[PDB]
Structures are given as C-alpha cells and as structure tokens.
Design a protein around this ligand. Structure first.
Ligand SMILES: OC[C@H]1O[C@@](CO)(O[C@H]2O[C@H](CO)[C@@H](O)[C@H](O)[C@H]2O)[C@@H](O)[C@@H]1O
Length: 129
C-alpha cells in the first residue's frame, strides 16, 4: 500500500509515534517519505547482504528475520515480511525499539541526511490530525 502524506501521519499518530522519544510526527513522516516513498512494500538490499523492509526500511541484520542474513539478530522478533503489510503496526512497534536503541532517529540514513535539521513540521501541514 502506498500511503498518502496525511493518511500516514494520522496512522502513525494513532500508533503513538507523535513525540515518541521526543521526535515530533513530522520527523516520522519525513523519514517514511525518503526511506520508502510511503510504500509499505519497499525492499532494498545492502552491500553487506542484509535487506531493508517496509515503510521505515527496517534492516534484517539486527531487527527482523528474513532467513537469508546469516549471523543476524532478530531484535524485533518478527519475520521481515511482516513489515511489508498494509497495516503499519509491526513497523511502528519495531521502529519504537530502534529509536530507543541509543542513536535515536540517526539510525535512519535518509532521516539524518534529508530530514534532520529541516522544517519537518511542513510534512504534516494541512493535515487533519
Ligand atoms: O541499527 C541499524 C543501524 O544500521 C545502519 C547502518 O549501519 O542502518 C541500517 O538500518 C536502518 C534501520 O533499519 C536502515 O534504514 C538503513 O538503511 C540500514 O543501513 C545504521 O544507520 C543504524 O544505526
């Protein structure tokens, strides 16, 4: 499913992401936009053999199991495929653990390079939340 900007903001808000660990909703929407273009079915393989899954591009080396990333952990205890569902619940709960890991949202490369330090509030402007 390819979410609409406001549609996703509302979904994330309902799942308790707004202000989660101090990160305003705009940050999460901005991260999703540049990580997957709001597409829950996005997948991208990295040089190390791991693969990123879903709307927030959760990595298989540490957060989920895809059965093909040897020596990897499954910190979120979920099959990576679960992160490609139209229901973002799985992705959200896993993202909550990732952002509490220590480096915050810096874990998401696109957020660090394209959202961090910008007017992220613009990502939810005009939306009915
Ligand atoms: O804990 C994940 C850790 O790995 C890095 C790369 O070193 O990012 C990977 O995981 C992210 C979250 O799942 C992906 O968005 C990213 O594309 C992937 O390389 C670090 O940025 C992050 O701290």
């Amino acid at each position: 499913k390819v979410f609409g900007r406001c549609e996703l903001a509302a979904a994330m808000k309902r799942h308790g992401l707004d202000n989660y660990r101090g990160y305003s909703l705009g940050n999460w929407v901005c991260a999703a936009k540049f990580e997957s273009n709001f597409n829950t079915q996005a997948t991208n393989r990295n040089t190390d053999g791991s693969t990123d899954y879903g709307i927030l591009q959760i990595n298989s080396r540490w957060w989920c199991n895809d059965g093909r990333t040897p020596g990897s952990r499954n910190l979120c205890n979920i099959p990576c495929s679960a992160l490609l569902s139209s229901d973002i619940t799985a992705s959200v709960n896993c993202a909550k653990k990732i952002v509490s890991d220590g480096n915050g949202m810096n874990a998401w490369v696109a957020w660090r390079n394209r959202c961090k330090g910008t007017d992220v509030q613009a990502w939810i402007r005009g939306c009915r939340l």
